[model samples]
Target chain A: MSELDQLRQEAEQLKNQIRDARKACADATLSQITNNIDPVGRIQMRTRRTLRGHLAKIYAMHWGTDSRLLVSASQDGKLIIWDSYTTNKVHAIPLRSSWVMTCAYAPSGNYVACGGLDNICSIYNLKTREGNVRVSRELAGHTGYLSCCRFLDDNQIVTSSGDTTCALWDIETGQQTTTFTGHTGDVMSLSLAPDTRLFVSGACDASAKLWDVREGMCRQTFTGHESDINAICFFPNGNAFATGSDDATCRLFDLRADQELMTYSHDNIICGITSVSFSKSGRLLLAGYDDFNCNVWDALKADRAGVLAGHDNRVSCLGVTDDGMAVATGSWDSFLKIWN
Target chain B: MSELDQLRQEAEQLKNQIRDARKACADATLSQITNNIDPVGRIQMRTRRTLRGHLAKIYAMHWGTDSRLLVSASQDGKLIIWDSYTTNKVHAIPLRSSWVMTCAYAPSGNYVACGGLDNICSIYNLKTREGNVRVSRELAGHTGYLSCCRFLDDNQIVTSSGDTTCALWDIETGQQTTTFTGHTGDVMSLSLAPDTRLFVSGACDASAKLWDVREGMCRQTFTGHESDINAICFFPNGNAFATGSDDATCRLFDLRADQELMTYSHDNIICGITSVSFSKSGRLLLAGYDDFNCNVWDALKADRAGVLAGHDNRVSCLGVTDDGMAVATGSWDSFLKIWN
Candidate 1:
């Protein structure tokens, strides 16, 4: 037989085999399975505390692993740590640059990192203080503004920049360990997996990419947003994650299925989303928007659960506490509010 | 100022900031760092035993989690489980189809899955039997030939097919749980991570992709191979993996580094590799070839350590025991050989 004829015969046989196999085993479509799942419960949260200390726009905020302590960076050239339960300012450190765009609390709660238009991520040891101020260890490499930074561990931190790259740094030696270069635009945000082996970055390229922190390679690229992505956060279980974008939407992407599971948005909400966070149970998704409001949505049902509307300016950043008790939002109004 | 002029001003400031940041923190390039790491040791292996039985070419083989039991499939229409250490056939079951191309022993050693031209993955419960033959629970959905199959757990199995997709199945219900669709070419081989949350698949498109097992999403695409990738195996630690390709070479890819670490090839050998495996210590790499031989190499150093030259035909399949004690090769000569 000719080669093409043989190929055709093989294809025919495969069809028969498929038909026979299907007769023995059944197929269950995804829609059928998902349709049967229970919708998540509604969330009712109210402003429990408002932290007012920064004189300028609050650009970034982070919750300590313990969830009791919080940190916020402002354009006023200061980084302040707060006891959220008491609404007390614990420490106010003067930053080397007032243009700071991102700040992160180390998982150990003993160190904090911040960086910005300075193109440098500065690490400060909280336990060791030289009077009221501390000398910082600078991680400087990116050629553009530093947009986001997070501690992978006490010894390592990952930073994203407008240079279109994310880099992992060794905190002790102040050396760049790995450079992740895949984004075509400024990397605005990044969230590490619970174990720190993987992280996801949202960029001006309008895509969210999952990355291996240790390998410094892009694991997956998620595209749906029509504009720049400003924020990214992992679900409590780390099986999935959420992203906020200038497209005025927030989306939940699951790593297990490798697809977008839900898009949280509304016809009336035209303002772009600046940040996103997930409640500890992953039942509620909180998204900060340019509308000066933080909207809460039932993560599974995609229904609007509630909204925090006290901020006077654009809500720039937000985070859910590790203990799941409270969530904090930082705004251009130069205020940080805690909701319970 | 116009938006364009404002953007230009911001760009200039970022450049200055980058320069200032670089002055405070030092950069260590990857090339300089990799140059200082020590090389790995060489490996030496020889054939330890040969189990001769099948009347046609042996298609596939797998080592049980305990490193004691093994299973092999052949075009001769039989599936045989062997006690590799004793070189004794434990169970010889006649398959429902002789065109079986792949077979895998469940990690629990209680089940075995096999599939091929049948377009159906049949799970045989080794613990249950009807007469001398056991009834198989068939997982059938693909419209093309089943090329490879592996058990994610006793209740779950993942399969790749000529349909250009991979699928996860619930064995108990004979239902497809998730379908992974990204490969433009036929899915050829797949290797699951130690934890089962992740997997890697090599395809005819000359690319290898890492996948999230639970989400059924393609996590990463690895491109370096110039021909179809025929085999893939994870390092003992699951932090890295290796692939054998029709390009006449094998490559070691590190998940931690997210890049190809080493290429195993020699000027004197021009045969396309059919199977690849890593020793327990991850120090040794063994690749079976279309040239009727299996070449052992220093996985890290990329140096050819030795060659096993007993097969009379192409060595189509090979595996390393879980305990790292021995290795095995299945050849077109219709015999399965064990190597130490």
Candidate 2:
């Protein structure tokens, strides 16, 4: 047979195979799908009362060890904790000074480091729902608002200050180890990649820089955002990361590709975004928005999977349950609620 | 040729005559073509002033009618009016009563209205910024924390209260013309459309609603936002509008079409989108996030224009000058500066 004719025959055979494959999947897939959705819809909303007396706006919400408690920091100068299962107040620790900016879970999730209007990063014990009055350490490295601080293994942690510096702190010694300073202005937000090998920082300077822990230097910088990049999260594998910016968009960076994977132009200033996660084994990626909604998109298929809505106020922070069955959101209305 | 063939030939000849129908729109598009030729990318930001001297966060800013001065409310319980061009204080008023939640200038810019934790809207003359013993008129209407209040015309004003009501008041009589109560919770924000026939309000109820003054009712309610609606404003044309929500999303609504035009999601829960404005020509929409950045976007094109970065903290409130040459923002840091 001629080469062209042979190629045509093979194409025809493949077409038939695709037809059979689609036929086999269509009915099963269609049957399992739920069509009930609204241009607006609700996922879940149950006001947890722990934050009722808090007068300041919440900046960050975190989950504690074993998923039994929820943690949040607010401008009201208080560190609040809630019993996750009962949705009741566990503790409300007052601060002598400062409007809280953000807090992060320790590796053990038994402690949280909150930094804000005041320069000091306060250490809090989750189980006791009390702040370490000693300050543990008063590393006076920042002259501006301290946005966030994260614990890095058992003995180390990193904090981002409005002074545009990221300081590495040793928990055991309560000393600042090294400082990475290149940001032009206040560091407003940050996220640490797993394993403490790298992390990301967003500053009022409108840039997100990637730092390599071992090298103690920034490895890469993302500068396309038009304003302060606010929220960032690293994918499970650490090969890629996601960032949300005041430009009303979320962007993905892939180390393997050495470029931006995609830019989600959401049109509202993106305030926060959790790292895209794999559900059912990387089949789905969840993208949450300040618009009080979460979108589940097919990570591989590149199609919108779904949008979850419930909160009655802008979703300030989100915590994905370890089991991946739900997400907990902190809001301005002084409530923390979970959605599935 | 046969008769049918002759007719077909004639039809083909007619098609050829009309195929280049560029002639149909030529004359009308002459100016458009001329203006498009080598158009320069000219975007210039003009600085108005660097307003200073606030003891606490400058949370409220109001532009006067003649554009001569700006009236501001600060957390220090002080309300001051400064010369817009000179940055010189014209009036320094102190409110010994409570924290001021909001303040506004009348359409004439001659009078002012301020709402605070006191639950009453205080009326005063611009000649005096002090909410003092200086001929103060109290509109004792609300029973909850008054969120915001604005003067509509010289004789009329509007106020939003935590009681979930928007009230229209007559300054001359100190009596409310009508009370608008459609929201489910605290009505924290409002802006009068240029036409004045309708006004938009955002509330903790998680919805943005349009109310017609004459009818004293909600003309339309906008949904899709998952959180409390914090801010809403109309485009220059008044035919379309936008709302900023705690959901960290801004929604564009086309009044004529009576539908949500678009939803712009931000990265985090929007602390408050203090202000949104359209450029002189109304093609560009500038949205200021509470996350320290104001983003510029192409509204008609449904995409990002660019992000303007500079502020060291969240943009608490902003004003677009009449010429659209400059945008001024106030922050919790107590720095009020202009952005070009």
Candidate 3:
């Protein structure tokens, strides 16, 4: 063939190639527009697991610090540790009081702490060689029901009580190390910073207080809430913490700056918050509401991510596992639920 | 080194590499766990845009076939076509009556139809070279207020009226072709089937009737509604249809089986359903209620999708775009809100 004829053939091939590319792009656009369109309206949120056996209302739930185990406290006088992913009941311990309201797991996941209307904090070792739960010790000094507790380490825990005070306890000896008593109303929730030195407590007095274990003194008090403060959780970086209140809002506070970082509010006229927890990365905030709603929000944008519905009553307590894969919520409907 | 020693060292290196790979996998999993952890309570449903030109309560809204324009009818005697995404008002046409209640876009995207208390259906050529919106024709036959209307084709239309009848009109000559007079009471809403051979009309007579548009005869009468049947719409496949009633329940019907396919009911007592619509995919249903709430429901499952709230008064009408990516809602609060 002549050189000019060969060039003409090559030009036709290039044009055909361009047309094919355009058709492929259009096909992909059409498929994408049909298959993965993000439309407006509601999302269906299904519970991953429904753990049974709690005979009465579940008052509190906590995540094991290092694993997928969840510790739940109920009004039926039962404390249960559940495998979050497998939906299996790993261990069940009978309590002495039917009004047990709060529980926590040690950082090592070897021990669990449960508190109740009896005002006693009970510690149990799960690794006992007797093929049964071993009663390690009972810390008993609070004059009222223990509302919240957090383990600073395997050997120490700080607990807040309705007696209007919070106490540091030695897990080995089962003795109170010190009583922190600045609040005039019931102390309801507690969160320990990752440093294991500073902790924050929320109370019915509508205030949150930062405390230093080294100084055994209250470092600062956050007093912006207009209603009972219900929950507190530490930011992943440990520089800040969050508090949820009956005032229909959640507020973040910076420890170093001694200022309010941000505020999250709901427009629901009759709903208030019952509990709050942060995702492991501190980028998402989850708050349980008295209206049977568990609200998930963007930590920085203060925008909604989605809403989970299934609980028939107020979500009384909630906790995110250390890896943040599963969130366990306890409700007044006597159910323990897990979601991701 | 000896051959045996060299092989053993290589084995150790391989084992270490596997350990590193396992660690990396675990890290990725943890990151994903945190990233995907958002609990449900409130969803990301927000008013993406608001069309604010109407001075009185908006009664109906419709989307153009090309997916670029939204036309809304209001009691202020105005019809406005808005750019769907940018929310700019493209055209505002003044109506002859201040009670314009319903409007619809033609399937060919070249014309619009609207009717109100003036007892006439007005047709406008949207692509005409006229300086402003120009009325191409008017079909005047209804003796009472036009309650609902929709386009049948490029040159035909159907309308329901309080005159106790629904009529078909020819746009070219502006004349009524057929009159459907089986409804014992004022017809409230009408929807054309996808097959174009049939249409459904709901009436204050507490029944919904399916009609053969060509035969001009009643085909099937849905008789389960307890009160006024306020709204009706066909499923995307035309094999089924859905009706919302003042009795607070929406029911689905199958044309082939001649049976009630499904029922979407809320437990609320005081709220009455005002409007019903099918998503473009027909996989979901959107229901507007007189209680100022819009509910999204799964068409296949006997479950709810989610509730969209914020209208201060009753939700009067609703429409979903052709792509199912946006929803337009008109309410008695004098606003037209879009959600996506």
iRMS per model, in Å, is: 18.6, 18.5, 11.0
Write one digit per residue (lDDT tens) for candidate 2, span B34-65.
22121112234544578887878777777776
Best prediction by TM-score: 3
Least accurate 10 contiguous residues by lDDT in model 1 chain B:
B22-31
Model 3 residue A119 lDDT score: 94
Per-candidate interface DockQ score = 0.01, 0.01, 0.05
Residue-wise lDDT of candidate 1 within B1-340, one digit each (tens)? 1499346435533433433343334343332445655655444567788887888899899989888789999998899998877888898889889988899999888899998898999888886565464756988799998989999889999999999999999988999999999998998999989888898999988888888987778877776675688898887788788999876778877775555666776644555778998888877789998779998886655667778889999898999888888889999898988878
DockQ of 3: 0.05
- The estimated TM-scores of all candidates read 0.47, 0.46, 0.50
lDDT of 3 by residue, B47-147 (tens): 88877777788888888877668888888888888886887988898988888878988988788878888988899887755577788888899998898
Model 1 spans > 4 angstroms off: A1-42, B1-340
Residues A87-154 of candidate 3 have per-residue lDDT tens digits of 77788888878888788887888888888788988888887545678568899999988998888877
- Candidate 1 CAPRI category: incorrect
- lDDT of model 1 at position B329: 94
| Model 2 per-residue lDDT tens digits across residues A1-340 | 6899999999899877756754564342211131111111112234333335557566677766456666777767677777777766676667666477777666686666777777877776554445443244444667778877777854677889878888888766667777787789788766777566788787778777888876778886665567776666676677777666666666666654544566554333345553233443444456656677666554442334365566566656666655655566666655565764
In TM-score terms, candidate 3 sits at 0.50
Best by lDDT: 1
Given candidate 1, what's the lDDT at residue B216?
Answer: 75
